[PDB]
C-alpha cells in the first residue's frame, strides 16, 4: 500500500524566487529529466506495482524528480539548497534501499554525477 506522496504545496511554508531556483528547474531539473536512466525517478516509487512492499519500512523520507519538478514550479522552495537537499535525499534513499551495482543505483549514480555537474556553478 502506497503512503501519500511527500507534499509539493503548503500554505504555512514562505515561497520564493531566486535566480538559483529557477535555473534548477529550466536548466538541471529539465535536462536531468531527460536522460535515459530518469524514468524510475520521474515520479514517487509504487511499491505495489514494483513489488517492493518492504521500500517504505525502509525509506521514511521519500523523494523523488517528480515531486521535485512539482515544488520548483510551485515556488515552493525558500532557497536553491532546499532544492538540492531534496535532490540528496532521492540519491541517499537509493542507495540505502539497493546495493552497489544493482541496475537502479547505476542509474542514479549516473543522474546523480550529471547532477553534480550542473549545479558545480549555478547563476548568481
Ligand atoms: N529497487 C528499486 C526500484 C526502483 N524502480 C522504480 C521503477 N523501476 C525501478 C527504484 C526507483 C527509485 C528509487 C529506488 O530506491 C528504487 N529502488
Not at 52 to 59: G, R, V, W
Request: aromatic share 12%; proline share 10%; glycine share 2%.
Amino acid at each position: 500500500m502506497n503512503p501519500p506522496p511527500p507534499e509539493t504545496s503548503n500554505p504555512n511554508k514562505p515561497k520564493r524566487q531566486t535566480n538559483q531556483l529557477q535555473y534548477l528547474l529550466r536548466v538541471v531539473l529539465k535536462t536531468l529529466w531527460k536522460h535515459q536512466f530518469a524514468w524510475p525517478f520521474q515520479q514517487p516509487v509504487d511499491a505495489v506495482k514494483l513489488n517492493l512492499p518492504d521500500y517504505y519500512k525502509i525509506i521514511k523520507t521519500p523523494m523523488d524528480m517528480g515531486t521535485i519538478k512539482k515544488r520548483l514550479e510551485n515556488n515552493y522552495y525558500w532557497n536553491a539548497q532546499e532544492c538540492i537537499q531534496d535532490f540528496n535525499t532521492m540519491f541517499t534513499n537509493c542507495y540505502i534501499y539497493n546495493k552497489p551495482g544493482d541496475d537502479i543505483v547505476l542509474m542514479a549514480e549516473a543522474l546523480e554525477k550529471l547532477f553534480l555537474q550542473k549545479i558545480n556553478e549555478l547563476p548568481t
